[PDB]
């Protein structure tokens, strides 16, 4: 009955997302805005040892032809499960607290705002999809992940980043992070997937039916072409039955994708500015966003305790 | 009122007579959603059994086995996970007239997302962190989730596994004991939770009304040192995964099928078990039509 605003800031790495969310949270209150960070200590210590290094080394060895596609795929798939775990778990313990649409739009101020560094679909859809484009994951495994994306509840606000390629390359080339290797092909792949993601949500919200438009696959705003959405990635010989039809297991995975993305509220944040500019731009975007009621009166303190515990335990140390 | 649905998941360890029994019962408003290789996967089952063998011989490391088992389990789970995800919107609340439709499933998503991963953990070929990642991905347990688990003396179970060719499989008695133990602990866990058990309250009992001892549930598996801080406490991320486990399993209705009899008796036993199973309503008048459409299309492949 108190209201909740949830805001997931996501998109390609290297844009300044992590900075922007911290600056926003810093704008004060503490008792009514909390940050759920990238679970770096999960990735690097708790779930497995140095998963980030494992990911970039695995692609490097593939690129150098030191390991096969199949061997790259099993390492990448398994690493991506480690990557997604904290997100999946958080979403699962949060879900029963989330009630109906409240409004924000002409509604009062949230009793609590949670700013997430990334949504579950980052590790369950977007990075797996980019790794597919990089030759280190199979499309079957990507759809296996899709089938496991948790139900999208009301008030799922996703903020995705925009940045010119040239500035983004520059931002990545300056960035130094344990185990990451500078890979401009992966950059291109991940930028593309998140572009497709934005288009997919618009497509679905404009009443798009991927089954209606499937034959059109070949090679804010108006309705996008299915070829500009994520559906375009899954018209691949490995998934096609002896008749050009998608095997039913795969077509159902795409139905799930549509059911998971359609309910999302997407916003685009311009990262081509100062850290404080990015913060205030984000601030403006939030005022209009969809809030929800929570399901119990003790829901707010519990959610707050969850977020702070998560941050302390899995947020970057040292 | 919307028509009623009965969902029945035939699960438990492989090699007990699952498929035979189900095929027999169906051969008589009743539809079988059978086992999915599935859609052209490079025999995952072969790689699973080969990997464990290579591990047991010291040909590959624990870590190497772990990446294969984790990737493999994702592949094995997909058919069940996708089936569950598309059916879910059609499932309404608990009802209690005969069901307009009975769906018999070959397995529940927990087999690939919990039970087999946990058995591989016991076999040293999966990390407990990966097992808890699969747990975190178990779909919310819907109303009327009836799961049938098998009872079979181990020696007869061994005979049954040996009775028929299984391409890619190796008869592994340690794995057989592991999957049997896991399913045994699954049944005890459901009873523990239905009896009001709180793993957080009982956790201290692993270090030394009526319900199973926590030591006889799935919770005992997760006292794994990989999951613990230097002071012995479970990390919150893993503890939250266990809260999730509790919420996934408590709602399930478990029925035990004695497989230690003739195929006819097994069929009959299974039918006997349905009288106590929980039915639900569907959500739309068109639901039954589309579910039968979804089960038919699933059947072709
Ligand atoms: C889901 C999952 C599976 N697996 C592994 C386990 C398996 O090794 C393999 C396939 O797993 P499956 O569950 O899809 O199917 P299967 O293991 O092939 O076998 P099932 O368990 O589906 O059925 P059964 O093996 O019981 O099938 P059935 O052929 O009926 O029984 C075996 C033999 O017993 C006889 N039989 C059947 N009923 C009998 C009875 N009442 N009395 C005496 N004999 C009986 C039959 O004639 C047959 O010879 O993959 C994983 O590693 N990870 C996973 O997540
Ligand atoms: C969330 C996520 C991040 N990453 C990478 C890209 C960035 O280099 C780093 C994010 O901090 O980890 C993945 O490879 N997979 C994922 O699922």
């Amino acid at each position: 009955m108190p209201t909740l605003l949830r805001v997931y800031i996501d998109g390609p790495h290297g844009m300044g997302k992590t900075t922007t969310t911290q600056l926003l949270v810093a704008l004060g209150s503490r008792d009514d805005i909390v940050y759920v960070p990238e679970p770096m200590t999960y990735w690097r210590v708790l779930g497995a040892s140095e998963t980030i290094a494992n990911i970039y080394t695995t692609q490097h060895r593939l690129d150098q032809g030191e390991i096969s596609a199949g061997d790259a795929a099993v390492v990448m798939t398994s690493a991506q499960i480690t990557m997604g775990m904290p997100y999946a778990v958080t979403d699962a313990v949060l879900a029963p607290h989330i009630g109906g649409e409240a409004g924000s739009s002409h509604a009062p101020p949230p009793a609590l705002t949670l700013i997430f560094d990334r949504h579950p679909i980052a590790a369950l859809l977007c990075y797996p999809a980019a790794r597919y484009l990089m030759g280190s994951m199979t499309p079957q495994a990507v759809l296996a992940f899709v089938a496991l994306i948790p139900p999208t509840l009301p008030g799922t606000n996703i903020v995705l980043g925009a940045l010119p390629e040239d500035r983004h390359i520059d931002r990545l080339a300056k960035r130094q992070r344990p185990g990451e290797r500078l890979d401009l092909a992966m950059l291109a792949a991940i930028r593309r997937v998140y572009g497709l993601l934005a288009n997919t949500v618009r497509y679905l919200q404009c009443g798009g039916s991927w089954r209606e438009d499937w034959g059109q696959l070949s090679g804010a705003g108006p309705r996008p072409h299915i070829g500009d959405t994520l559906f375009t990635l899954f018209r691949a010989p490995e998934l096609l039955a002896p008749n050009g039809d998608l095997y039913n297991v795969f077509a159902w995975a795409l139905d799930v994708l549509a059911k998971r993305l359609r309910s999302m509220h997407v916003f685009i944040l311009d990262y081509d500015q100062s850290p404080a500019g990015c913060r205030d731009a984000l601030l403006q975007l939030t005022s209009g966003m969809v809030q929800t009621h929570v399901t119990t009166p003790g829901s707010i303190p519990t959610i707050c305790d969850l977020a702070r515990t998560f941050a302390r335990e899995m947020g970057e140390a040292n």
Side-chain angles (χ1 to χ4, degrees), chain A residues 4 6 88-100 151 153-154 292-297 299 302-303 306:
Chain A
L4 178 74
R6 281 160 39 252
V89 107
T90 291
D91 189 271
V93 303
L94 210 17
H97 286 108
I98 302 160
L153 300 190
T292 68
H293 297 113
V294 288
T295 52
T296 74
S299 273
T302 297
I303 292 170
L306 171 66

Side-chain angles (χ1 to χ4, degrees), chain A residues 54 58 67-81 135-138 141 145:
Chain A
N54 186 21
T58 296
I67 62 169
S68 60
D71 297 348
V74 310
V75 172
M76 201 63 65
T77 299
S78 157
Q80 278 298 143
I81 292 288
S136 45
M137 267 184 77
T138 70
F145 280 92

Side-chain angles (χ1 to χ4, degrees), chain A residues 13 38 43 52 55-56 80 83 87 118 122-123 127 175 180:
Chain A
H13 46 107
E38 280 189 337
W43 301 343
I52 288 156
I55 286 159
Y56 288 88
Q80 278 298 143
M83 290 303 281
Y87 290 105
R118 296 186 181 283
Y127 281 86
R175 155 192 257 220
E180 276 183 14

Side-chain angles (χ1 to χ4, degrees), chain A residues 296-316:
Chain A
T296 74
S299 273
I300 298 295
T302 297
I303 292 170
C304 185
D305 285 343
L306 171 66
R308 285 179 181 155
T309 296
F310 183 115
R312 184 225 76 220
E313 182 173 274
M314 289 181 286
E316 180 91 83

Side-chain angles (χ1 to χ4, degrees), chain A residues 186-201 203-217 219-262:
Chain A
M186 175 63 181
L187 184 68
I190 198 68
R191 284 172 59 92
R192 179 173 183 219
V193 169
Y194 275 103
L196 302 182
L197 198 222
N199 288 341
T200 304
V201 170
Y203 177 85
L204 296 165
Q205 295 196 322
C206 305
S209 149
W210 75 261
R211 284 172 182 274
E212 272 180 32
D213 302 326
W214 181 256
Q216 308 177 329
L217 296 173
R223 311 192 333 124
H225 194 288
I226 187 164
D228 300 327
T229 74
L230 287 160
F231 294 113
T232 202
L233 303 180
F234 302 106
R235 37 135 209 117
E238 14 221 16
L239 309 176
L240 259 35
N243 61 341
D245 268 321
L246 235 21
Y247 286 108
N248 290 287
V249 69
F250 300 127
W252 289 4
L254 297 189
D255 296 336
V256 180
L257 186 69
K259 256 155 25 179
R260 310 274 94 105
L261 305 183
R262 187 143 92 262

